[PDB]
Amino acid sequence: GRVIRAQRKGRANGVYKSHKSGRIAPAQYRVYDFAERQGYIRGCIRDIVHEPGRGAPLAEVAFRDPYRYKTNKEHFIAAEGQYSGQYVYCGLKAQIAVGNVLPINRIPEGTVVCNVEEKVGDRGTFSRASGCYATIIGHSEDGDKTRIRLPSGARKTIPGSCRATVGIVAGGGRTDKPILKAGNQFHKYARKRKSWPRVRGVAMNPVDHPHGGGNHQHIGHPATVSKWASAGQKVGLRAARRTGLVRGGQKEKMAMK
RNA sequence: GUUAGGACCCGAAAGAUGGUGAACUACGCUUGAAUAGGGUGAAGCCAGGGGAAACUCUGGUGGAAGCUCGUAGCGAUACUGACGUGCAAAUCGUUCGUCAAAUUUGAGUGUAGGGGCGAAAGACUAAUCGAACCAUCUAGUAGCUGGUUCCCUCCGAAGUUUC
RNA sequence: GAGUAGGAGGGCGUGAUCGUUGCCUAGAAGUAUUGGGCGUGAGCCUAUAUGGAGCAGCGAUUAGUGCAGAUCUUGGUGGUAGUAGCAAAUAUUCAAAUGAGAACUUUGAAGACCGAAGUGGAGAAGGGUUCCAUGAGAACAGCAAUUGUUCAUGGGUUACUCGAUCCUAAGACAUAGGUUAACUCCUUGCAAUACAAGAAGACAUUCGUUUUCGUUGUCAAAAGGGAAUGAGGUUAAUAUUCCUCAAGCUGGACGUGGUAUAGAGCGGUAACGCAAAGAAACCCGGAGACGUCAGCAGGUGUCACUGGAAGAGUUAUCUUUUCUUUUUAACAUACUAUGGCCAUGAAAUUGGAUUAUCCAGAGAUAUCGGCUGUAUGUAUGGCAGAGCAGCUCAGAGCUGUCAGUUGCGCACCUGAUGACCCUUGAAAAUCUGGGGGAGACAUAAUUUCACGCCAGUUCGUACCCAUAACCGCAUCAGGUCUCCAAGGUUAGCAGCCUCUGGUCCAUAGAACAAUGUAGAUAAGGGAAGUCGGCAAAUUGGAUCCGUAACUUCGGGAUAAGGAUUGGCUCUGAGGAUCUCAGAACUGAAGCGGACAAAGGUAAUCCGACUGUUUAAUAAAAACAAAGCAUUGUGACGGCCUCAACAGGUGAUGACACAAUGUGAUUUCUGCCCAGUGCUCUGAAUGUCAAAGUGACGCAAUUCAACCAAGCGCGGGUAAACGGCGGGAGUAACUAUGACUCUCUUAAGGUAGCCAAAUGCCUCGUCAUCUAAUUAGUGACGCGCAUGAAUGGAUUAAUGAGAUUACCACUGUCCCUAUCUACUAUCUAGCGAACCCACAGCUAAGGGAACGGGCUUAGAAUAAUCAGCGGGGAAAGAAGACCCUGUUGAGCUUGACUCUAGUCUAACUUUGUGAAAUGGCAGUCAUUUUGCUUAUUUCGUGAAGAAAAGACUGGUGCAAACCAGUUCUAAAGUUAAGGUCAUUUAUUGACUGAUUUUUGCGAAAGACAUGGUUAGGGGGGGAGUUUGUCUGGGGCGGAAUGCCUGUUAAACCAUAACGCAGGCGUCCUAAGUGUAGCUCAGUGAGAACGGAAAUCUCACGUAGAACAAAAGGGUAAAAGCUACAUUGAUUUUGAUUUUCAGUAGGAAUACAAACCGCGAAAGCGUGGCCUAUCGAUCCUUUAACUUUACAAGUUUUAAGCUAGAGGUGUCAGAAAAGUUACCACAGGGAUAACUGGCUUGUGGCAGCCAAGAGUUCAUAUCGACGUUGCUUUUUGAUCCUUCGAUGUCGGCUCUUCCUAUCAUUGUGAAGCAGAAUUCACAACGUGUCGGAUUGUUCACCCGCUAAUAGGGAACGUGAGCUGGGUUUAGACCGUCGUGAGACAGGUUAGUUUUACCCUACUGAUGAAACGAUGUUGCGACAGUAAUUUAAGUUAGUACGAGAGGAACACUU
Ligand SMILES: [Mg+2]
Ligand SMILES: [Mg+2]
Ligand SMILES: [Mg+2]
Ligand SMILES: [Mg+2]
Ligand SMILES: [Mg+2]
Ligand SMILES: [Mg+2]
Ligand SMILES: [Mg+2]
Ligand SMILES: [Mg+2]
Ligand SMILES: [Mg+2]
Ligand SMILES: [Mg+2]
Ligand SMILES: [Mg+2]
Ligand SMILES: [Mg+2]
Ligand SMILES: [Mg+2]
Ligand SMILES: [Mg+2]
Ligand SMILES: [Mg+2]
Ligand SMILES: [Mg+2]
Ligand SMILES: [Mg+2]
Ligand SMILES: [Mg+2]
Ligand SMILES: [Mg+2]
Ligand SMILES: [Mg+2]
Ligand SMILES: [Mg+2]
Ligand SMILES: [Mg+2]
Ligand SMILES: [Mg+2]
Ligand SMILES: [Mg+2]
Ligand SMILES: [Mg+2]
Ligand SMILES: [Mg+2]
Ligand SMILES: [Mg+2]
Ligand SMILES: [Mg+2]
Ligand SMILES: [Mg+2]
Ligand SMILES: [Mg+2]
Ligand SMILES: [Mg+2]
Ligand SMILES: [Mg+2]
Ligand SMILES: [Mg+2]
Ligand SMILES: [Mg+2]
Ligand SMILES: [Mg+2]
Ligand SMILES: [Mg+2]
Ligand SMILES: [Mg+2]
Ligand SMILES: [Mg+2]
Ligand SMILES: [Mg+2]
Ligand SMILES: [Mg+2]
Ligand SMILES: [Mg+2]
Ligand SMILES: [Mg+2]
Ligand SMILES: [Mg+2]
Ligand SMILES: [Mg+2]
Ligand SMILES: [Mg+2]
Ligand SMILES: [Mg+2]
Ligand SMILES: [Mg+2]
Ligand SMILES: [Mg+2]
Ligand SMILES: [Mg+2]
Ligand SMILES: [Mg+2]
Ligand SMILES: [Mg+2]
Ligand SMILES: [Mg+2]
Ligand SMILES: [Mg+2]
Ligand SMILES: [Mg+2]
Ligand SMILES: [Mg+2]
Ligand SMILES: [Mg+2]
Ligand SMILES: [Mg+2]
Ligand SMILES: [Mg+2]
Ligand SMILES: [Mg+2]
Ligand SMILES: [Mg+2]
Ligand SMILES: [Mg+2]
Ligand SMILES: [Mg+2]
Ligand SMILES: [Mg+2]
Ligand SMILES: [Mg+2]
Ligand SMILES: [Mg+2]
Ligand SMILES: [Mg+2]
Ligand SMILES: [Mg+2]
Ligand SMILES: [Mg+2]
Ligand SMILES: [Mg+2]
Ligand SMILES: [Mg+2]
Ligand SMILES: [Mg+2]
Ligand SMILES: [Mg+2]
Ligand SMILES: [Mg+2]
Ligand SMILES: [Mg+2]
Ligand SMILES: [Mg+2]
Ligand SMILES: [Mg+2]
Ligand SMILES: [Mg+2]
Ligand SMILES: [Mg+2]
Ligand SMILES: [Mg+2]
Ligand SMILES: [Mg+2]
Ligand SMILES: [Mg+2]
Ligand SMILES: [Mg+2]
Ligand SMILES: [Mg+2]
Ligand SMILES: [Mg+2]
Ligand SMILES: [Mg+2]
Ligand SMILES: [Mg+2]
Ligand SMILES: [Mg+2]
Ligand SMILES: [Mg+2]
Ligand SMILES: [Mg+2]
Ligand SMILES: [Mg+2]
Ligand SMILES: [Mg+2]
Ligand SMILES: [Mg+2]
Ligand SMILES: [Mg+2]
Ligand SMILES: [Mg+2]
Ligand SMILES: [Mg+2]
Ligand SMILES: [Mg+2]
Ligand SMILES: [Mg+2]
Ligand SMILES: [Mg+2]
Ligand SMILES: [Mg+2]
Ligand SMILES: [Mg+2]
Ligand SMILES: [Mg+2]
Ligand SMILES: [Mg+2]
């Protein structure tokens, strides 16, 4: 009657607790200054650094505070091509250039974007991953709706007034180089909550996991588990609509269209 | 003499309640320490021959890798060696795996019992683990094993019936 | 006159209580008795001795009242036994001294060890006084002790600069807020799930006053950050602390000098410079502040060498010799230092530059150029006065401590670089700098200059840090984190040897047997040893040669293989202002001379690789992994956590996170969606709850209708679980095999691939390898049971992974020998433990079927010592196997019951406008559309919300729009300016910077969310169950409830998983009655007519029929036919069978009825008789002046009697698996081994004689039959062993059997010789070497006189071995949904104890008829030699020939 690893990941005292010591700051947008809603504020890239858990570089941006003498530092998401010492413009009137931040409604159809906002003033939500971009599909005439195409490829309607970064998230392509050694995988996952290495549920004894069968090593019970499966029940491919790999009758994706 | 109770006395593998442990050991984390001398020879760089250049061949230079021989360290293959009322409740001799990483290691700090923690052996969790340890309910129940303490005299069995 | 289990009657002995009678310092109780007595016996009385204060009898009362046991409790003691033993870590020895005593103490003299990876010098953790001195009886320091880590007594731990204290980290905890019955719990640095929380200044100097800026805590580092100290000297024990001398730091407070200014240093073109050169808010910096690795450069320390001086060692010989000292702290001043800058000038015939990179018109190179940064550098101060080394004097004194050189040497540090990351390598306190210039100030004000004055608190500072101060019950061969490191050899921090420093501590002496532990070496052969090359052996460095297949082109690779290596004397080449190569000579042809240091090759299987794993039996083929693939999720979300409020991932956002699977590359990925699952924006009414609705009722209720999810229906889905046959036919000897048809609700083994680590048969078949191969490899494949990410086929590198050859190699073997050390031995000293009913010689016998004890025989002499492994069915542990238990636990599910998260519906939280519609007399039901204030979500240093307006500019008709901040890693703050007063000052007031507004901002909005109910779902989780009998259990079967005939033996009764069978129904007639008839069958006879249809007669004891099995019963019937009728009915009770003489099932006889049939008697309470069946509680029904308990009427609800609904395990529980991860109580009531009975089966013998032997039964055999024997087969049984008799085989060794293989002497023959066969006396002696296999067996290759068969607990595990078998890891196949399982393969997997008694082998040995020698006798015990060959016989006898002997003699 043991507790699977599946379950042990929701414990906050637990072993799976993110390794946060390296985190520089949250990467978000500027605060929603009056300046940004009605005008433009400009800042500098003091630097673009590497946060230890992030694929995408972070940009360190100096802004002058509208209301005081203080100089405000903030950390944005690197838009590919942004240079250290660049001028970055955020707001209503800010024009279209790589790394500037406008409302989506002001961004032309077909344009590529970063760090979009789900609700206005998110300081960012969508397409933050290294190399990711969101695609601008359409605007309503009113100006209040915008159709975005997310990396996953699902289309989404967002209030047009939302903040977006012109361009693509930096450091793209990393996902493409094969990792040859296991050690690499190790160091990588060292800076995030530990997912590694992964022991197959069949290796284990019936006590450690629904799968581990026994004398043979098989699942022996259907591995498509229903969405309502209880905590320790939910193990295989959950709520899966299809299972196999589609080879051969691929013309079906087309003919079905 | 029936029966209830500690119920002639001693005896479980178990249950439940409420506590205590991560000084061993398992996995994080912060912050320190540590690993002779060799072999090999990648990019990158120089020159010589050929070429108009691209590039080619020969010779250097350079110093890569979860590469290699091999100490210390970390480990544990074999003799099925020694010892087996030990030096020792896991040691000793030879031998052996690995030896700049998924390496070794100190402290501090996160995880506690149907819970942790696990490169998964039902492994580890203070000589305790296919459910720790401490006390209590608890003299737990025992159709089962063992014991059941002075004398003489007299009567004297059953192992079949039924449920 | 017996007696276990058991019961009764009397009695003995012990406390204490109420009585009664007494005894005791003139000696109570208790205790010892080879004193004297009493009881059959419990027990008693006395005597003597001891003892030194209480006792005793009798009658009752009461009881913690009697012990040999319980592996019983606690305590005390034996034998073993002066035994096992005190043997790791190389070592000690001599003299003196001290002491009662010295192998073990102290000095000296010798010999060795650790050998700067220490047995050295110091720390952290841990210890806590173990430190120092003096003293010392016992104990302890496993011998000893004069000695101590021990005992006693005293004494030791000084700090501004070391550390703690401060800072921040991983973290953590308050406060606030919220949750809990409560305890508890949730949040908080990016600080909050919080928030009216703060700090500073000045005057005041309290308050107060006043001003300024402001959201809010703390703890966690004796290795991280971190203000400043050094050298010398001193104590018995402390010292970067005390003393002496010399320094630095921070905080104070003034003094004296000096900088700067009427606003605030001076020099240089410039980098920049110089003791000093005004300041607040405010904002920004620098240092602190950082990874790993590789090479280069420099410095420190060390090491080496050179001249000088002092000392010491050597001096027969040689040595201008060999060793030693020859030092310089922090700190002060000045200079130099791997880089970077500034000029001037610009570079192409491009240059510069590093070992490496790399730089330049984005200005390189270069200038008698210049500036700047870092010392663990130089000089001087310190400083020689100290320290060190010498030499004098009797505490004082003198001399010298000097001047050079080099290093790929070594350790550390620094400097400039380079390489690396799907890694990118803290923070804060602290010190300091910049931008800004609001304030302050004339007798003034302010200022990082000198020199002087004052202070630095609290705690830790001893000592060990380990083969004796820690943890391992210890002075334990284990374990436990760091720093410093010398010479020689050398690649080397290796090994070996040394110097500094340390140490000889491990009880000792002597002998030198067996056996052992460790170390070596073996002629000839070379794995023949063995499950196996286990173990050992070989190989090994460096230089030169030479180097295959295979391959992922990296590799393979020291592949394989072949040579060389010393010494000495010369020669040449590489460099600054230590490497490399040649030649010659010389030796026992040796020379990596010690040390160090791979054995190869060819195949097969796994896993791709580095990595991981079962602390203490598994290191692997298991896990991991990179790659492949699949699922889920766009945040109103996924996965998980959570008692609650709530939370984590998330400082996140698809190149992301959460679930699985497969397992590098290469190649391939067949066909099945019927099932189980999962899924869907499909259809729809089949099914379905609470609430709400409708109808009946003064009502409770009941009845109806509607109704979410889920179910069912339909679609999708196999890199989801999983599946990939059975039958028939066709071609037709079958099989396998081809096609076809067919059946199950899918499909019907596609590519591939094997007797595979997955084929039973199996030692498959053929090749190959060998002399011989159940082994290896390659092939074939009627694949028991191969097959595609439940992955299939491949595969280089690779491995303490499985297997087979071969080469080298060898003590594995033939075959065993010898040598060393430590033991065993003996001695001084010291000194346990296991175990122990009582004990210990056997033979048989019987016996609980292997006695030590008993019967009968053999027989039997003290006490000892070293050995041993036969016996004590020896020790170990209340069997881990097996069964039993109404005993468990781990795990599983399609077991029973339930259960958290979850899905769905209702009511509620719940507001308000409007519209549309229906009903009601403004309200209500329904639909639609709003609003926002409840509610929810997310933000924000709750600034620019919503609505209006304005300056400038531009576009511009108003309107509206655009701009007043887009080349440029800068600056933008205590403000200007206008208007109006005071006051003449950044004074006062407005404006500069519009207005209004009882929403900080945004997103949802009565939705969601929360609360309670209702229906789904739920091995994630809880609880529990998972019959019995049984020739062990299981699988099977029911001898589980019933009936008949047999076993059963003439009343009844009687066992077995004993025989042969039958029951859980069937029947409105097959019950009941009346009447009539006589059936089965046989002979003879009648159109179609036939063996058989109907019709006749005669005869028919019953041979037919009677639902069902059997047995019995029946002839004007019980049978056949016809008709009538419900007695298959109403009351009770009794009787018989089984029997507890309970129930239940059956049936019988009565008494009351009400009937049917018959004229009537009569017969009917079911079937001719013997089987056909079912309690308590509950429900339902029938019949009844039973009750609802103040009184009533209802409705409803309870009752009494009796049926039906049922328990088949049938006297009647609601109940699935797995465990090899396992557990407990027991069981020899019961399996697995030996032994016992049996002997079918196995084996071995006979009797008869049909036959075979050409002729002839019995030379040699023996059919059909038949009598036996044996216990090396197997079976059967269950007697002994379940608080354990160690369960296969081989090795080793001994003995016995004879059913004789050989050898000896013979008989017989279908015996010529030779060979062979049968038989007798007979084991006396012998019965071998290898292939394959764990093997017993089997089969082959061989030699041989022969290669006999057996026994001894299937001889022989405190004798080995451990291959097989049978725990725990893991692979395949088959089975199961699963956990798991195989009576199927694979692979890894512990083998303990002897010192006792006996036994045997050896060895001493007391004592009688006096002692003691020498020489003998010999009882008895044991015995030992067995074969073969050659010559000769002899080419002989015999024989047609082929062929072919023997005795004697000799070796
Ligand atoms: Mg916590
Ligand atoms: Mg990839
Ligand atoms: Mg499970
Ligand atoms: Mg298994
Ligand atoms: Mg598998
Ligand atoms: Mg599998
Ligand atoms: Mg009584
Ligand atoms: Mg009683
Ligand atoms: Mg208990
Ligand atoms: Mg508890
Ligand atoms: Mg710890
Ligand atoms: Mg070691
Ligand atoms: Mg050995
Ligand atoms: Mg070892
Ligand atoms: Mg019983
Ligand atoms: Mg008493
Ligand atoms: Mg007296
Ligand atoms: Mg008396
Ligand atoms: Mg006396
Ligand atoms: Mg009495
Ligand atoms: Mg007693
Ligand atoms: Mg006793
Ligand atoms: Mg004793
Ligand atoms: Mg010993
Ligand atoms: Mg020592
Ligand atoms: Mg030491
Ligand atoms: Mg010391
Ligand atoms: Mg913190
Ligand atoms: Mg916290
Ligand atoms: Mg300091
Ligand atoms: Mg001082
Ligand atoms: Mg001062
Ligand atoms: Mg660096
Ligand atoms: Mg000299
Ligand atoms: Mg310079
Ligand atoms: Mg002097
Ligand atoms: Mg150097
Ligand atoms: Mg070091
Ligand atoms: Mg960096
Ligand atoms: Mg300034
Ligand atoms: Mg020790
Ligand atoms: Mg000795
Ligand atoms: Mg030899
Ligand atoms: Mg040979
Ligand atoms: Mg030889
Ligand atoms: Mg070996
Ligand atoms: Mg090569
Ligand atoms: Mg070679
Ligand atoms: Mg090879
Ligand atoms: Mg030579
Ligand atoms: Mg030469
Ligand atoms: Mg020579
Ligand atoms: Mg040699
Ligand atoms: Mg080999
Ligand atoms: Mg491997
Ligand atoms: Mg691990
Ligand atoms: Mg381990
Ligand atoms: Mg996906
Ligand atoms: Mg899969
Ligand atoms: Mg497939
Ligand atoms: Mg309803
Ligand atoms: Mg077909
Ligand atoms: Mg084979
Ligand atoms: Mg062989
Ligand atoms: Mg073969
Ligand atoms: Mg290998
Ligand atoms: Mg002697
Ligand atoms: Mg002795
Ligand atoms: Mg007998
Ligand atoms: Mg006997
Ligand atoms: Mg006798
Ligand atoms: Mg014995
Ligand atoms: Mg014994
Ligand atoms: Mg169970
Ligand atoms: Mg429910
Ligand atoms: Mg369960
Ligand atoms: Mg029967
Ligand atoms: Mg009977
Ligand atoms: Mg039957
Ligand atoms: Mg009649
Ligand atoms: Mg009966
Ligand atoms: Mg009658
Ligand atoms: Mg009934
Ligand atoms: Mg027979
Ligand atoms: Mg016969
Ligand atoms: Mg038996
Ligand atoms: Mg035993
Ligand atoms: Mg025995
Ligand atoms: Mg005979
Ligand atoms: Mg015969
Ligand atoms: Mg052999
Ligand atoms: Mg045996
Ligand atoms: Mg096993
Ligand atoms: Mg299966
Ligand atoms: Mg098996
Ligand atoms: Mg003993
Ligand atoms: Mg003897
Ligand atoms: Mg005489
Ligand atoms: Mg004599
Ligand atoms: Mg004599
Ligand atoms: Mg004799
Ligand atoms: Mg002869």
Whole-angstrom CA distances from A227 to A8, A123, A151, A191 are: 19, 33, 25, 31
Cα atoms found within 13 Å of the Cα of residue A217, Cβ hemisphere only? 5
Give residue for tokens 């977006």.
A164
Give this entry's resolution in angstroms: 3.5
A146 exposure class (CB count in 10 Å sphere: 0-12, 13-18, 19+): buried
Residue A6, φ and ψ in degrees, nearest 5: -45, -50
Contact by Cβ (8 Å): A55, A130: yes
Solved by what technique?
X-ray
Neighbouring CB atoms inside 10 A of A15's CB total: 10
Whole-angstrom CA distances from A46 to A38, A54, A82 are: 25, 19, 11
The C-alpha angle A63, A69, A70, rounded to 5 degrees, equals 50
Contact by Cβ (8 Å): A31, A58: no
The C-alpha angle A233, A239, A245, rounded to 5 degrees, equals 120
Closest nt to A16 (CA→C1')? Answer: B28
User: What sign results for the dihedral spanned by CA atoms A87, A83, A98, A163?
Assistant: negative
Closest nt to A71 (CA→C1')? Answer: C283
Q: Which residues, at least 6 apart from A187, have a Cβ–Cβ distance to it below 8 Å?
A: none
Nucleotides of C under 7 A from a protein CB: 169-171, 187, 190, 282-285, 421-426, 608-610, 622-636, 638-642, 647-663, 669-671, 673, 675-680, 716-722, 790-791, 890-894, 900-903, 938-941, 943-945, 963, 965-970, 972-973, 1001-1003, 1016-1022, 1371-1382
CA A94 / ligand 85 centre spacing (Å): 122
Residue A43, φ and ψ in degrees, nearest 5: -145, 170
A216 touches strand B (CB under 7 A): no
In whole angstroms, what is the distance from residue A250 CA to residue A253 CA? 6
A236 exposure class (CB count in 10 Å sphere: 0-12, 13-18, 19+): middle
Q: How far is the CA of A37 from the C1' of C690 (A)?
A: 54
Nearest Cα residue to A92 out of A156, A161, A138: A161
A74 exposure class (CB count in 10 Å sphere: 0-12, 13-18, 19+): buried
Residue A28, φ and ψ in degrees, nearest 5: -140, 175
